[PDB]
Amino acid sequence: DPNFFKMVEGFFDRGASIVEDKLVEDLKTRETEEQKRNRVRSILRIIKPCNHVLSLSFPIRRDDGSWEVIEGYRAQHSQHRTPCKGGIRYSTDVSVDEVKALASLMTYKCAVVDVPFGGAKAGVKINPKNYTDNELEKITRRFTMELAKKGFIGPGVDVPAPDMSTGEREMSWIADTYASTIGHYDINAHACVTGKPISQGGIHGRISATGRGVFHGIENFINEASYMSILGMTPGFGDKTFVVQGFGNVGLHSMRYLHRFGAKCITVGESDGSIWNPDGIDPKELEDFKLQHGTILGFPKAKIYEGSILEVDCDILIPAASEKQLTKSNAPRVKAKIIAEGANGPTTPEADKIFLERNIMVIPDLYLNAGGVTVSYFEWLNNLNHVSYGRLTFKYERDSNYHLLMSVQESLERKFGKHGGTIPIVPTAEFQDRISGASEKDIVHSGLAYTMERSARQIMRTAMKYNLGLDLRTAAYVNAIEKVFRVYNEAGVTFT
Amino acid sequence: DPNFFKMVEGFFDRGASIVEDKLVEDLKTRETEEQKRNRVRSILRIIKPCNHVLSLSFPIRRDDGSWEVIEGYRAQHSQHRTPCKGGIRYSTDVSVDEVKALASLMTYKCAVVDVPFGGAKAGVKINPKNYTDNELEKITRRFTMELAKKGFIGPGVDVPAPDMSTGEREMSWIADTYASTIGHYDINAHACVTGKPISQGGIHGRISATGRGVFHGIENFINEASYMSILGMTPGFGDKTFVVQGFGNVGLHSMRYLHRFGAKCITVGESDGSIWNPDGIDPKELEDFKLQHGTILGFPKAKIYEGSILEVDCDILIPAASEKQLTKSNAPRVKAKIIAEGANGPTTPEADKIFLERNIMVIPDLYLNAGGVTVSYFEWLNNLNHVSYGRLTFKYERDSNYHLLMSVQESLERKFGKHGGTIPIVPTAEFQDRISGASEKDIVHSGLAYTMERSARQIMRTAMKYNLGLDLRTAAYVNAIEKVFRVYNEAGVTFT
Amino acid sequence: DPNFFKMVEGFFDRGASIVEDKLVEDLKTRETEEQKRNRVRSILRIIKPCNHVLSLSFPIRRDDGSWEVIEGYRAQHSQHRTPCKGGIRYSTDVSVDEVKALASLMTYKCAVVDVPFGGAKAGVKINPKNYTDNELEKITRRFTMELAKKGFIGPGVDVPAPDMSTGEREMSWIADTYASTIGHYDINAHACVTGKPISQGGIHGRISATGRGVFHGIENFINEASYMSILGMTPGFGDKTFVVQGFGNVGLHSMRYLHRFGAKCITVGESDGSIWNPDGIDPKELEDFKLQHGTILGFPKAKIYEGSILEVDCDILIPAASEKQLTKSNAPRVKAKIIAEGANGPTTPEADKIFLERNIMVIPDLYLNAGGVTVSYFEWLNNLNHVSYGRLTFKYERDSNYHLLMSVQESLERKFGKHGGTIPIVPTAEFQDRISGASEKDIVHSGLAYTMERSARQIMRTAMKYNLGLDLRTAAYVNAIEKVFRVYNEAGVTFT
């Protein structure tokens, strides 16, 4: 049970060794092979660590009149490409080391998806549940009152974001503080953060984003025969066994979108148990009980399945919530062709090997749960371009989108409308639905997928280049580094 | 052999005289004809000079331990419309006067193409070749360390750029300095400069931009019969003799794009000699030797042509590199209907007259080599909107771009698909190539051409308005001034 | 052998317990004894920790072309009273914990002497000796390039300073960086740091300051009979045995000033050995060999004394350099009435008890080595008032300083100068020496002593108030906290 930090650090190291072999070969500087090799080697010593790490102490007053001190950490991995991004996490497992990872992680996560942001993250040694709303509203707006004094929060330095144990309220609190302490005139203050509610500049779609980011991520591969062949599987979703573990968020919004395109999901894993219905389960009906029961168990159309989800005979498996759920004890026990890994580090390094030995494909946590980052990026622009996307264009496009058809109509009626036969060219129900449903919801759904699309394709290439086969986890950490490295190299690596 | 400055100044003067005749007539102020004429007249005394010109001195330390002082000049023509733009030039021909021109030039260049920027330029009395990479990296990052202390470098004051003797490295160096001296949080620091590499916010297409800007510039005229008639020529490129002088950059990337649309280029001029093949030459094969030989001479499929390119019997002639190449001695000797003038001041004032007497059309250096500016402008936005263009839209457009076709299909199958005959409407190879090739490369190629398109059209008008016929050089300097003047007039000309 | 951190933390804790007993009694708020006691108690939980602690990573390039990463720490104890102060230390013993102490220390050190500054400190995991001057000049100016991006260096946030392993050069380097990265116009940039050379705004006297701060600190007690009586000693210095350990700096400049006022120093401790001359030793003659020999040993007029300085039969003992030199093994072995503790933590907690049991007075490291801080404060003003002290006044005072005497002369000659007898009132050699020697050297020497004077007096009071007798170390940590606490209380303790 290594520390998730040590997991990460262990990976990057491996990727570096892989990269260097050629990265030195494809370096176009006039130097000695040795000389230049000592350039790259150290650069891969430079980015790995996290530049700035700050430790705090808060004199907050409780509701009972008492005082207590609070520790808070912010980690800003690398300045190679600002601004920097990172969510906040209120918990008691926090620690300096636990952070540097996730910042040094999100960075690599962002690069895979071609995002400018730089990785960061913060945390606080605290358990929210023991504290009220007011207290938390006293904590937060003081937290981001300090960091702002110290240049770790600004629309072009560092951008907080949500995470488990947080929500819009928390964000909403922050942004106000900033505007009342720093911006005071600065227009870009509305971009201080992300994940805001919709009324201030948020997004129609954030909540389900991640779940989607999983989906289009899987799609870019399942529809890829080059790997179907390897796993003896078939392209498409119309005939496949799908399951989930970590119901709730990302487990769900994916399950639903998943159900949409011909999927047949079978099971559900929950902190309290499981279910099973080889006939396929409606996510909708489950959405109900999650609110009408606070649990999955008791679902009429599924048996309370004994055992872990992982041991289910299926095609896909989605460890959306549990961390380190896959071990050498289960890796052989799993029954699946593919794994998703929505959550971060649901899988152990040892297992990955076992899968590669079982010819089991997987997906890296980076790629999938990225969409929860991607969307933010978009939301970080809405607050900069100070508009909802498209509102200058929807109707214009619309107009053109049916002046054309008219042109077609006339063009045809002109040629073989000889007798005058009219061709009432019209939209399609769907296409008409898009039109009247014109809204950011459609844009984002697009600028998200395209992203996840392009990224995957780069990865496949990256895999082939290095003959990694199905060992994508590395391949991603690979494709990331090359981008990162390439950046830091072309930045005048340092002015000292 | 006047100084390129004196050339410029000589032109503007001429344009003013031409403009005033009507600019006073079309001025809508309640004044006396005389009174108002004394308004315009002086305004054309105001813009002409360059407001700010700074002279520097650098205590740099060589690699040998020695010190030496270095002089550096920055010229910011006019504040009438900030920000201001201007590249850098490392040479020993530099001088205050040599600058004011090019700044006072780029301004007028920018206006022709409807660009906000204001003209500037910098230079340094130095010969790079005698200095290392490190030294230059010591020079530059100190150069832009001073100017920043003094408000001549900022994403909304003044924007450096490349030029001969410079490259991405130089830029890349600068931007880092700025972020480490001024921005420190400012998001727009990524726009401090332009011409950056691609990894930081550069562009897919810069290198060939200029060459293209030449092309679409020629196209907007060759396809214009109104001038074909005058020169007894034909519209199109499918039947014309093309040549070049100044092979390398802009000479090349144009030659290639030129070759694409039915051109037949015949010759090449190079600092070391020339070639000739009335059968037409593949730029590609030339691209090879330029790298496999560092020269054109020795090209199998062309004779080493004796004489200057200018004296070749052709339809187009492109003095892409040489300066002041066209004199009264050659002006009559030239064999051509049109000239391009990619470079700046390849042609002499005296010659222009001779051409007008020989009924020879030409093109102003302003218009053509503008694209090397235009593109930058775009690149200056990529770093402000903090995105690669379109990524929010490509797939959305894509979707719509084939939901429509479906609509057509259904619409037709509905009317005279009576028996059920299906119409498998599909894209075209080309159109499908666009789609999968979706990228900035296509956007920029567009927002460039359109620009060069609209501009030309304004010029034609401007020519007709003033009955200049083929004497475009003036006409441009004309169309520019009116815009400029119009700006400075509507700006509350001055608050003093 | 506890960590110097743990030493410190152990002290403050003790002081708090002592303070609270009355601090709650002298709190003038309308509350319940319990209620208010829960106010103070926690406040003494708040100040103790250090608010901001930053960890860094530097991509520096060596002279050999290689790269290496460097870690650097800055600790800004408390914002209760900005700006904050702290020197820098280049070593390899550095660590986060090792810092928080010294920052949380200097704070309390500053308060004793009624200084606004807030404690901070920085360090770097590095050994200078293995690196050149250039490298260090590459390290430093990058170090303070980051911290400035992050608001840990500024004339009104945080003020670096020298320390062992540093010197004026290091400072001089920094200040330039700042002016070239942040100030750019800010007048107060000349105050970014302290310890500067004299040519930029430094001070005539810094080097010997500390040594002096020791002296006047001892004087305020030795001349105090109230404690002479306790130790059975005599006031004055004219008859006392003085010694030293840690020759070099502070050991020396004190020894000299010490020699001036009737002292008779006997021995010297050095890293390499010792000497002894009951006849008294001229510091001057020693100054010579320290430069003519790099050592004390071989001094003609002193025997190479076997044993540690501590075991010498004397009246005063000055552990100026060695850390943790005094242990339970030596505490009883020491032969002395008083200890100085110029260095930080030369003495162990256990020993202090033993001394109190041996009726041995001591002095806290805080008080004495403070002068090295005090002076800086002054130097931090020279760079703000942008003048050398007094230059507006010396001659004015001078004038008045002898218009008076004239008045006396005339006044006397008027009354009983009846016959006309003239009274040539004149200055004294000394007083005339002051005049012609008018310079900062005299001011600082004053504003230093007065400080150390007033402080001590507060401490005596503080001791009596709490009946600590000779256990001053606490008493200081006591007098400090009350000031600190009092500050943080009257600051609207927090706006959350």
Ligand SMILES: Nc1nc2c(ncn2[C@@H]2O[C@H](COP(=O)(O)OP(=O)(O)OP(=O)(O)O)[C@@H](O)[C@H]2O)c(=O)[nH]1
């Ligand atoms: N679909 C769905 N949405 C939910 C659920 N719970 C909360 N939501 C929120 O409701 C919103 C519904 O999104 P819509 O914009 O109405 O429809 P959509 O974006 O096209 O797709 P869905 O989000 O799946 O409905 C989502 O953005 C979620 O934030 C749920 O169980 N199912």
Ligand SMILES: Nc1nc2c(ncn2[C@@H]2O[C@H](COP(=O)(O)OP(=O)(O)OP(=O)(O)O)[C@@H](O)[C@H]2O)c(=O)[nH]1
């Ligand atoms: N075409 C071409 N590109 C070159 C040449 N030399 C360097 N390049 C670079 O290669 C890039 C090729 O551009 P692409 O994006 O691949 O293709 P394109 O932009 O549609 O058109 P081309 O630039 O002419 O290839 C250009 O942007 C140049 O910067 C050359 O000789 N020919």
Ligand SMILES: Nc1nc2c(ncn2[C@@H]2O[C@H](COP(=O)(O)OP(=O)(O)OP(=O)(O)O)[C@@H](O)[C@H]2O)c(=O)[nH]1
């Ligand atoms: N006195 C003294 N000064 C030294 C010695 N070594 C270096 N110095 C420097 O020389 C300066 C001499 O100070 P001065 O201003 O000339 O005289 P002062 O300040 O009245 O008293 P001193 O510093 O003891 O000489 C001090 O500030 C030190 O920085 C030394 O061994 N003895």
